[PDB]
């Protein structure tokens, strides 16, 4: 599936960056957290979400796993808004922001940007978001275009200490490109 392909892409991008300590912003029900907790490669798996219920559901399904020795203590769930500057966000190798930006509204998107690229300031930021151009041709009116996604990223590289690289997720179409947009930000 695409979701699965997205999880593989994200995890692959994290390992190539040697990012061991990961904090997933807007972690929802823990799909990525699960995959990150079963893999000893990772040393810190932190999930953040504004809804405690989502975190409650994450704990439940993550608990269905069976892991060796101390691999459980690598986990940490934190409730919080993506706009709230929390001290606990400091010190990670990478922050993952998967299928989240298209849901934020202009107002809190600004604040989210400071919290992430200015405050937390991890070494690596991975962000994925749907490609509305793809989903239209092949058939969610809130998804971004590729152009919209790239101006946003470059804007970030001008306001904050980061450079950015893009990569395709899902079979790419010559014209509208791939179904999922992905951007890796690397601190300067």
Specify the number of domains making up the chain.
Answer: 1
Q: Are strands 44-49 and 180-187 parallel, antiparallel or unpaired?
A: unpaired
- Which sign does the torsion angle of CA 132, 145, 92, 77 carry? negative
Task: Write the CA distances from 115 to 25, 28, 83, 111, 177, integer angstroms.
Answer: 11, 18, 6, 6, 30
CATH classification at residue 13: 3.40.50.150
Nearest to 44 by CA among 75, 15, 14, 19: 75
Distance, in Å, from the CA atom of 64 to the CA atom of 160, rounded to the nearest integer, reads 40
Q: Are strands 180-187 and 162-169 parallel, antiparallel or unpaired?
A: antiparallel
- The phi-psi region of residue 18 (left if phi > 0; otherwise alpha if psi is between -120 and 50; otherwise beta) is left
Annotated binding residue at 82? yes
* Reported resolution, Å: 2.5
Distance, in Å, from the CA atom of 168 to the CA atom of 112, rounded to the nearest integer, reads 24
3-state SS string for the chain: CHHHHHHHHHHHHHHHCCCCEEEEECCCCCHHHHHHHCCCCCCEEEEEECCHHHHHHHHHHHHCCCCCHHHHHHEEEEECCCCCCCHHHCCCCEEEEECCHHHCCHHHHHHHHHHHHHHHCCCEEEEEEEEHHHHHHCCCCCCECHHHHHHHHHHHHHHCCEEEEEEEECCCECCCECCEEEEEEEEC
Phi, psi of 5, rounded to the nearest 5 degrees: -60, -30
Distance, in Å, from the CA atom of 101 to the CA atom of 69, rounded to the nearest integer, reads 36
**61-65: Cβ within 8 A, 24+ apart:** 61/29, 61/30, 61/34, 62/30, 62/33, 62/34, 62/37, 65/34, 65/37, 65/38
Distance, in Å, from the CA atom of 183 to the CA atom of 1, rounded to the nearest integer, reads 20
Strand ranges of the sheet holding 75-79, from the earlier edge strand across to the other edge:
75-79, 44-49, 21-25, 94-98, 124-130, 180-187, 162-169
Phi, psi of 67, rounded to the nearest 5 degrees: -120, 155
- Buried-state track 121-153, b at ≥16 Cβ within 10 A, e below 16: bbbbbbbbbbbbbbeeeeeeeebbbbebbeebb
Annotated binding residue at 39? no
Cβ atoms < 10 Å from Cβ of 70: 7
Residue 185: which domain range?
1-188
Nearest to 51 by CA among 83, 81, 20, 96: 81
Distance, in Å, from the CA atom of 141 to the CA atom of 35, rounded to the nearest integer, reads 29
Distance, in Å, from the CA atom of 164 to the CA atom of 156, rounded to the nearest integer, reads 9
Indicate which technique resolved this structure: X-ray
Q: Are strands 21-25 and 44-49 parallel, antiparallel or unpaired?
A: parallel
Distance, in Å, from the CA atom of 132 to the CA atom of 71, rounded to the nearest integer, reads 39
């Amino acid at each position: 599936s695409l979701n699965q392909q997205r999880m593989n892409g994200v995890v692959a991008a994290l390992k190539q960056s040697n990012a061991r300590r990961v904090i997933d912003l807007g972690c929802g029900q823990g799909n990525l957290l699960k995959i990150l907790l079963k893999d000893s490669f990772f040393e810190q798996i932190t999930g953040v979400d504004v809804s405690y219920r989502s975190l409650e559901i994450a704990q439940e399904r993550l608990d269905r796993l069976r892991l060796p020795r101390n691999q459980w203590e690598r986990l940490q769930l934190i409730q919080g808004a993506l706009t709230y500057q929390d001290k606990r966000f400091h010190g990670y190798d990478a922050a993952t922001v998967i299928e989240v930006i298209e849901h934020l509204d202009l107002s809190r998107l600004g604040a989210f940007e400071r919290v992430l690229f200015e405050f937390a300031q991890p070494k690596i930021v991975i962000v994925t978001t749907p490609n509305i151009e793809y989903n239209v041709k092949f058939a969610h009116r809130f998804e971004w275009t590729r152009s919209q996604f790239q101006n946003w990223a470059n804007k970030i590289t001008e306001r904050f200490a980061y450079n950015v690289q893009f990569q395709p997720i899902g079979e790419a179409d010559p014209e509208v490109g791939s179904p999922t947009q992905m951007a890796v930000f690397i601190h300067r």
